[PDB]
Amino acid sequence: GIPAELRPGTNQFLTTDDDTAAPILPGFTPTPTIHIPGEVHSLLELCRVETILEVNNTTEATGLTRLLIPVSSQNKADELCAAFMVDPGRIGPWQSTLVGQICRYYTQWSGSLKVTFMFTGSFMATGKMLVAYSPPGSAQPANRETAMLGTHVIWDFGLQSSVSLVIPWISNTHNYDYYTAGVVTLWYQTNYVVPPETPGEAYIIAMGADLYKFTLKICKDTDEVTQ
């Protein structure tokens, strides 16, 4: 026949190798396909769906109460409310999102994010909050003045009920911890103002998502599953 030479790699099974396997049941035609709605062509479709950050993670909160950011009328203007890192792939309050869970399947990510704050008060409650982002390489701001000297939003929840803050760029390369973080904080610009005979306590809900600029690489397996 045709002269040939076997070569290194002969008779080995590589698990990632794309090759042909013999059909064991030829002449079999599977069931024809139909149109099922909601087909998914990428995991990036699932990153971009904003899901609830659990910012209240504490030994003192149990149920849905870990998904709620408390805002009351006892607090005084100029003082902090909540602070959390922007790190979808680390241990903290990104671990309840989808971005958080998908990042566990990849070694590197990068792109931009979006964080949405949603105020649930009474219709007649009013006030302002300062939603600020300190970039990586700096500690969280010490007071409102230094939070106001950087990227931020003044959000009056008497007028507007929901506010979004785009984080311009984040990256995790990758047991020295290579991700230098950067933080979102919440400040009281005013004091929460309340009319007579209405609760005077409300909750903020936080959400997070990836913008279309976000990407992922170097597949792996999640640290959550043990087996």
Partner: protein
């Protein structure tokens, strides 16, 4: 000639003879993914200008000096301010080295630019401190010039962008260095891109009555700087 950039003006001769490092000019970055989101800052007003260090005194017993960039500029002017914060950094430089010496002085200086120039330990594993990696504005002096303190022959230092200063012919040298890195932006604080070196190969010689020490003056002009998000 007189070169005037911003509020600084230096006296120097006009000569088309310069050394382009590797043959390319400083350029602004090709558009990237991160900086498309946040447009980077390209300051030239008071930021890009001539900075002139404290001049160095070359004497018969010397060894020679080196500097690390961006580091040498990390505490200076309005560049060191932008060098602080701004976690993304890119830039080229214009380096002019001068020597004031009479016609009765003799000697020569090798002047080179070394990318990713790493001083090593002279020992065990004595990891060299922040003093050798970040000597600051003053700079450092060599221990073993013959090996460059990298474990490498100084004879072969000439595959680096370089110019001789021979007190016979020329008293000055100018090297244009673009940005050279394996990534478009990097951290100016924790990473020095390259370093500058002036080593007397032929020692300084003079007859009694001459000045015993010859000054070497450095001048640094940034070119095509870019800075990132503010820390």
């Amino acid at each position: 000639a007189q070169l005037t950039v911003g509020n600084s003006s230096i006296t120097t001769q006009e000569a088309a003879n310069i050394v382009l490092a590797y043959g390319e000019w400083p350029e602004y970055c090709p558009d990237t993914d991160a900086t498309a989101v946040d447009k980077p800052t390209r300051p030239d007003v008071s930021v890009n200008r001539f900075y002139t260090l404290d001049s160095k005194m070359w004497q018969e017993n010397s060894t020679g000096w080196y500097w690390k960039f961006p580091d040498v500029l990390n505490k200076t002017g309005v560049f060191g301010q932008n060098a602080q914060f701004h976690y993304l950094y890119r830039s080229g430089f214009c380096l002019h080295v001068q020597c004031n010496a009479s016609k009765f002085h003799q000697g020569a200086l090798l002047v080179a630019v070394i990318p990713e120039f790493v001083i090593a330990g002279r020992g065990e594993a004595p990891h060299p401190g922040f003093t050798t990696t970040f000597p600051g504005t003053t700079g450092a002096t060599f221990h073993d010039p013959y090996v460059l303190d990298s474990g490498v022959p100084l004879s072969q230092a000439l595959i680096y962008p370089h110019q001789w200063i021979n007190l016979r012919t020329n008293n000055c040298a100018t090297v244009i260095v673009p940005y050279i890195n394996a990534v478009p932006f990097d951290s100016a604080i924790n990473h020095s891109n390259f370093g500058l070196i002036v080593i007397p190969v032929s020692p300084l010689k003079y007859s009694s009555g001459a000045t015993t020490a010859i000054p070497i003056t450095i001048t640094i002009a940034p070119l095509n700087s870019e800075f990132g998000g503010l820390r």
